[PDB]
Amino acid sequence: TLKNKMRITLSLPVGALINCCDNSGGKNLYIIAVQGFGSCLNRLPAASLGDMVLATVKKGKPDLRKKVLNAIICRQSKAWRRHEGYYIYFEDNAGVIVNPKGEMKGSAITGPVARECAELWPKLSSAASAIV
Amino acid sequence: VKTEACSFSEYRIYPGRGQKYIARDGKVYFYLSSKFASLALQKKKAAKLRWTQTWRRNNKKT
Amino acid sequence: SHRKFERPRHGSLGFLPRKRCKRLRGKIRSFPKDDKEKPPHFTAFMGYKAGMTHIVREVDKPGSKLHKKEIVEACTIIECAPMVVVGIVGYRETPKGLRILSTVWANHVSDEFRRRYYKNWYKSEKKAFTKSLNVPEATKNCLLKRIEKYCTVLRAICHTQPSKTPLRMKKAHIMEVQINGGSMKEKLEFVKEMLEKNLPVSTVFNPNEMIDVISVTKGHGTKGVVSRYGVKRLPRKTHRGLRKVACIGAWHPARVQFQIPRHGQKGYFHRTERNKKIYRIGLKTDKNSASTDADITEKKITPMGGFPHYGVVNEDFLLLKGCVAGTKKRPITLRKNIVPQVSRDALAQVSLKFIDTSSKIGHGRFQTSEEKVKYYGPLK
RNA sequence: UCUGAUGGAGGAUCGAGUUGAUACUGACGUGCAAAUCGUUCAUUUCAAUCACGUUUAGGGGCGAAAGACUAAUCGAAAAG
RNA sequence: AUGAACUAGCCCUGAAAAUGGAUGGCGCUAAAGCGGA
RNA sequence: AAUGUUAACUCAGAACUGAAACGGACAAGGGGA
RNA sequence: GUCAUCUAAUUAGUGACGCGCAUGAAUGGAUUAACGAGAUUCCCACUGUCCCUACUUGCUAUCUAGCGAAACCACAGCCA
RNA sequence: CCUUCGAUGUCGGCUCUUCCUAUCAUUGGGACGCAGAAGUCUCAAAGUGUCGGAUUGUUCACCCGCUAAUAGGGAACGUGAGCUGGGUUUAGACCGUCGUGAGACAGGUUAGUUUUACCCUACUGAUGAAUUUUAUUAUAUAUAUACAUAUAGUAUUGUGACAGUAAUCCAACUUGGUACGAGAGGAUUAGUUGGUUCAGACAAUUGGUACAGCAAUUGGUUGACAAACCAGUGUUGCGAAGCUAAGUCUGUUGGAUAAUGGCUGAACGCCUCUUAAGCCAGAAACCAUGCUGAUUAAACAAUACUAUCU
RNA sequence: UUUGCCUCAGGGUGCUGUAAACAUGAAAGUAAACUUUACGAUCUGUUGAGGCUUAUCCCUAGUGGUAAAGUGU
Ligand SMILES: [Mg+2]
Ligand SMILES: [Mg+2]
Ligand SMILES: [Mg+2]
Ligand SMILES: [Mg+2]
Ligand SMILES: [Mg+2]
Ligand SMILES: [Mg+2]
Ligand SMILES: [Mg+2]
Ligand SMILES: [Mg+2]
Ligand SMILES: [Mg+2]
Ligand SMILES: [Mg+2]
Ligand SMILES: [Mg+2]
Ligand SMILES: [Mg+2]
Ligand SMILES: [Mg+2]
Ligand SMILES: [Mg+2]
Ligand SMILES: [Mg+2]
Ligand SMILES: [Mg+2]
Ligand SMILES: [Mg+2]
Ligand SMILES: [Mg+2]
Numbered sequence A: 001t002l003k004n005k006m007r008i009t010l011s012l013p014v015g016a017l018i019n020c021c022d023n024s025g026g027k028n029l030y031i032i033a034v035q036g037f038g039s040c041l042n043r044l045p046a047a048s049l050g051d052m053v054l055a056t057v058k059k060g061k062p063d064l065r066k067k068v069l070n071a072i073i074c075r076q077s078k079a080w081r082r083h084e085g086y087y088i089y090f091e092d093n094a095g096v097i098v099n100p101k102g103e104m105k106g107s108a109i110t111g112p113v114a115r116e117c118a119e120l121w122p123k124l125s126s127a128a129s130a131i132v
Numbered sequence B: 001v002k003t004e005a006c007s008f009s010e011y012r013i014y015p016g017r018g019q020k021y022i023a024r025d026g027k028v029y030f031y032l033s034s035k036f037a038s039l040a041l042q043k044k045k046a047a048k049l050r051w052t053q054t055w056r057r058n059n060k061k062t
Numbered sequence C: 001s002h003r004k005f006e007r008p009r010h011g012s013l014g015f016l017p018r019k020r021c022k023r024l025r026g027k028i029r030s031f032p033k034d035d036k037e038k039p040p041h042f043t044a045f046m047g048y049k050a051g052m053t054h055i056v057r058e059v060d061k062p063g064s065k066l067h068k069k070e071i072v073e074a075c076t077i078i079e080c081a082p083m084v085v086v087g088i089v090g091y092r093e094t095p096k097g098l099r100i101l102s103t104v105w106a107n108h109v110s111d112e113f114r115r116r117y118y119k120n121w122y123k124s125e126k127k128a129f130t131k132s133l134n135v136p137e138a139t140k141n142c143l144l145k146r147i148e149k150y151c152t153v154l155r156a157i158c159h160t161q162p163s164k165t166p167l168r169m170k171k172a173h174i175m176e177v178q179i180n181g182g183s184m185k186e187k188l189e190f191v192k193e194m195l196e197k198n199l200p201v202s203t204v205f206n207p208n209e210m211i212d213v214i215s216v217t218k219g220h221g222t223k224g225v226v227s228r229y230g231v232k233r234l235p236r237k238t239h240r241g242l243r244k245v246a247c248i249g250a251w252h253p254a255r256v257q258f259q260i261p262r263h264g265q266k267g268y269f270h271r272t273e274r275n276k277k278i279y280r281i282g283l284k285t286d287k288n289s290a291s292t293d294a295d296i297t298e299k300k301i302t303p304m305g306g307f308p309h310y311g312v313v314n315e316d317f318l319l320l321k322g323c324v325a326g327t328k329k330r331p332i333t334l335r336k337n338i339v340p341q342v343s344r345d346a347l348a349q350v351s352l353k354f355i356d357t358s359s360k361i362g363h364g365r366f367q368t369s370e371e372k373v374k375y376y377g378p379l380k
Numbered sequence D: 001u002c003u004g005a006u007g008g009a010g011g012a013u014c015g016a017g018u019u020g021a022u023a024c025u026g027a028c029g030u031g032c033a034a035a036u037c038g039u040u041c042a043u044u045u046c047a048a049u050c051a052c053g054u055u056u057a058g059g060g061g062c063g064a065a066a067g068a069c070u071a072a073u074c075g076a077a078a079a080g
Numbered sequence E: 001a002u003g004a005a006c007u008a009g010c011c012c013u014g015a016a017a018a019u020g021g022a023u024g025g026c027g028c029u030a031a032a033g034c035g036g037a
Numbered sequence F: 001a002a003u004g005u006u007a008a009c010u011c012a013g014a015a016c017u018g019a020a021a022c023g024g025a026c027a028a029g030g031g032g033a
Numbered sequence G: 001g002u003c004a005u006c007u008a009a010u011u012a013g014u015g016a017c018g019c020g021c022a023u024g025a026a027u028g029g030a031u032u033a034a035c036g037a038g039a040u041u042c043c044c045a046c047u048g049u050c051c052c053u054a055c056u057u058g059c060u061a062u063c064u065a066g067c068g069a070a071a072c073c074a075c076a077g078c079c080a
Numbered sequence H: 001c002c003u004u005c006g007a008u009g010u011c012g013g014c015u016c017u018u019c020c021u022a023u024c025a026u027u028g029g030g031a032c033g034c035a036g037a038a039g040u041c042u043c044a045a046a047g048u049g050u051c052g053g054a055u056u057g058u059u060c061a062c063c064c065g066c067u068a069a070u071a072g073g074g075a076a077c078g079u080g081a082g083c084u085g086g087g088u089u090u091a092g093a094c095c096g097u098c099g100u101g102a103g104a105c106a107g108g109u110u111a112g113u114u115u116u117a118c119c120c121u122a123c124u125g126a127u128g129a130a131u132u133u134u135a136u137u138a139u140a141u142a143u144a145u146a147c148a149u150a151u152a153g154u155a156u157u158g159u160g161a162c163a164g165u166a167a168u169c170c171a172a173c174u175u176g177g178u179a180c181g182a183g184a185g186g187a188u189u190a191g192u193u194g195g196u197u198c199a200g201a202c203a204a205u206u207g208g209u210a211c212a213g214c215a216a217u218u219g220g221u222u223g224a225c226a227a228a229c230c231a232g233u234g235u236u237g238c239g240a241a242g243c244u245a246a247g248u249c250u251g252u253u254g255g256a257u258a259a260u261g262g263c264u265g266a267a268c269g270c271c272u273c274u275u276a277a278g279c280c281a282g283a284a285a286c287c288a289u290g291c292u293g294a295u296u297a298a299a300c301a302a303u304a305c306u307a308u309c310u
Numbered sequence I: 001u002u003u004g005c006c007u008c009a010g011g012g013u014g015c016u017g018u019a020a021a022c023a024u025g026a027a028a029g030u031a032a033a034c035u036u037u038a039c040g041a042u043c044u045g046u047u048g049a050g051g052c053u054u055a056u057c058c059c060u061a062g063u064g065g066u067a068a069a070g071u072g073u
């Protein structure tokens, strides 16, 4: 289970509200923290495609609200450099709720998912339709 | 050399050049340039732009 | 009181006096240690920065998520017209540092070289070197003998041939190049063999060699603290101004300290970047210079419309991985590394798949003008 | 008792100007200025605004009251 | 001629604070230190 | 009742039209609990 | 202050509770639509406020020609 | 209550640097109630780091969360001609208690001008002459010579004393479900690939930027068309080049040590790491190497040419 | 500082997006003649046109230019 992840453009900072992408019943995700983020005086922690966040669900099933909950980003709109030289971007910022281990709380994943994420989280590849 | 094609225009995109926009569905659009990407964003229709290949074809200008 | 939240200092104190470099021609501060087992070879080479292109390279790193895949990488191009050797200088080691014994000159020294010894060539009677050139060979021989006897280090006085480049300046760039090899005698012999003749880069570097690139950085004149050190902007509310340092220092050392970031020169600094890989060494006598196994199309390295702000590379050149200090047109000194590197990075053999030659003056669509012409067709 | 017109009430509404002076605690602060400048702002048919004339004078005046103002002078003017 | 116990000289530990650093400084150890004459 | 000479400016509706844009500058409430 | 609620977290806000250091009835008490350049909190929109700065425009600064002050000033002007 | 009342701007935050170690983490160790893992105590260590938020004017505090760790401090309780001005500490006003009252409150609440650098220094960059009681690590054909060399001016190339200094930490995976363990669990170490922070550049590429430029277009104006203009840059679209980060590249290895463990080995017929002499290995420390400056050395060398030189 | 350089021009490279002009071309329609003649956003053809492209792009022995004549040792 490799967490080898080539660096990807950072932009989804704390406070960002992203589409929930999932079948969990959550509509939104408000990102409160990035895992593996360190220390930098005034820098907002900011997550990218592979990254594990900690979020709340602002809108969705009440059993999801009022709690801090792990998620993975699946799509972003900040364009990022694929190493074949082209910059990819999605139209939306969107992630999927999971457990600390990385197991989905939901069952399917609605839209597309970046390959950068597929390579990182096998259980996520499973439930992905278009993986691009 | 594997030259992808510009989606909005029909230009050859040589490696390490353009950008790739993956829409709501899963459909990828590869744009050769900034201008083309901007046009795409603006929801502009290539078949209505005099300079592009799509327009040209429609008016049989080969 | 202690600063509430700790943070690393902003500049590097290792690059202080952030003042202008004395000369465009980056000086080599130090040359590789001498390994007297190996044959005598030059350690350095001057070239002019022409621009950057990008490249496509297949990767080898077993274990990377980037393993078998083609990758795109930026690379500088450094035009490398053959340097010409003109002198030998002999140093001897003293408790006060290196002291020169002598310099021995070629019999014929180029006009270009001579131009360096004048600031008004056009006016001058160009008398420089006209008596030295004359001198009898016996004296030279004697000097050489002396060098052999006493001098521990040899440097060659080389100069560039800027006439063979799009640059404006007819003046040569003259540079001492340490020779590293076995016996002083051997070194001397080597230099004699060389002397009046030309070094091309292939005689100095090889494909996949890791090299240090020493050059004066791009200038920006007097720059603010924010730009020069990456100091934080103060907030909008600030009266006297936002783009400054709020507190120079404490009260008590009652003296601004040299460690505090201040407005002043930025750029045109001397800088050695280390571990830059040579991806390719071009040859003047190669029309398929920017071509590759995967390309198989006649390409010269010059992009369409030519290297912006430089011109047309018509001579042997270095493709260095990544970036190099200074501007298009800047002299660059490439130096062998001071340690013989065995890291997988230095050993890896590169195989370019593709080298971009699309116009750098815009978002170029095509490689050659021919292709463009084909695309367009016959027109007005 | 509803519906549509009419009608044109109101210390009604918004708002140029005018009268002010909320914020930027912006500019300025050896100023253009012993209070200005900018943008923003509040005021506009009434307890409205302005002019001129006129009344009220110092322990006095005048005050929708801030000890405000009473010629850059005010918890007692200025002049001698 | 070893084993104890004490004893007091010098020395060591105990002995950690913020500008750089002060037997006044350099330095000094067959003292240029400490105690004498 | 039909036939004349003749006037503002306002409303309402429909085609086509454009790189989907149109109080195109100017001017002009942020709103809610 | 305790309990809710707002938040991932709230010395804030709101709703409750009340033997209230020292609330309370024209010292007016309790409540109130409308109104407010009023005080306070939250939410949507929005944004360079911020991440995280960059680029850019005038007018200054800058150099020149001309003109040309002042405050300040025991003497002056490196540190441990 | 020594200083300051002919004024040292009186909290906190923001910014920014430096220092301390009474070490939180990282390096190297020693101990254990150390099987492993985790942790506790402790030695050399201040090289590197020590964050994002919610509430509070706060310091302090308290939670949320990341983190290797979220150690503690100082520098006129660092830092107002740096800001801010929320608080405290003017004048307005309100409440509560106290006072007959004016008023008081180290009780609460709201509204409330933050001046000047053009001086010296310091620091940052920027030119720049001068330098014979001064210099010199040698020159000259095995001998000589400091009882000696050295004119000066341009320029090139060097020397490099001295000063500065830079990289940092983590993860994942393989080593290994191994060592260890009744089992649960479960490493060190290297190795690989990545990332964080920082630094230094750079602009091929993506993005940003527009008063190069092209096109559109509103209102007006030139009879119309065209060509234009005006609206302090009229407003949009694209926008090269140049700048630029959120984009790309790069960031060493010796010496000698500290802690410590040892070696030989007395004192003390044995033992003893030395608490003698003599040695060894050994740290993110130190000093070099490397890197920046070097009118920091009033420094100097060589070379090139010259105007008179001996 | 005359095998340079500036200067225009051409060519390259791009940027923009198809110039003016004419077309018994097309056009939602309208009116007014005895099938033609007016008006008509806009579109199409000639038209990847026209314009711009170094002021800090590139090339070209393509054009015309290259003065001052002073100071210091
Ligand atoms: Mg902060
Ligand atoms: Mg762009
Ligand atoms: Mg370019
Ligand atoms: Mg006021
Ligand atoms: Mg102000
Ligand atoms: Mg001022
Ligand atoms: Mg008055
Ligand atoms: Mg003495
Ligand atoms: Mg709040
Ligand atoms: Mg309440
Ligand atoms: Mg009472
Ligand atoms: Mg003071
Ligand atoms: Mg300690
Ligand atoms: Mg500890
Ligand atoms: Mg104190
Ligand atoms: Mg101060
Ligand atoms: Mg102040
Ligand atoms: Mg303060």
Ligand SMILES: [Mg+2]
Pocket: H085
């Ligand atoms: Mg206040």
Ligand SMILES: [Mg+2]
Pocket: none
């Ligand atoms: Mg008050």
Ligand SMILES: [Mg+2]
Pocket: none
């Ligand atoms: Mg650009």
Ligand SMILES: [Mg+2]
Pocket: H230
């Ligand atoms: Mg006009």
Ligand SMILES: [Mg+2]
Pocket: none
């Ligand atoms: Mg743009």
Ligand SMILES: [Mg+2]
Pocket: H267, H276
């Ligand atoms: Mg002993």
Ligand SMILES: [Mg+2]
Pocket: none
């Ligand atoms: Mg036309």
Ligand SMILES: [Mg+2]
Pocket: none
């Ligand atoms: Mg030019």
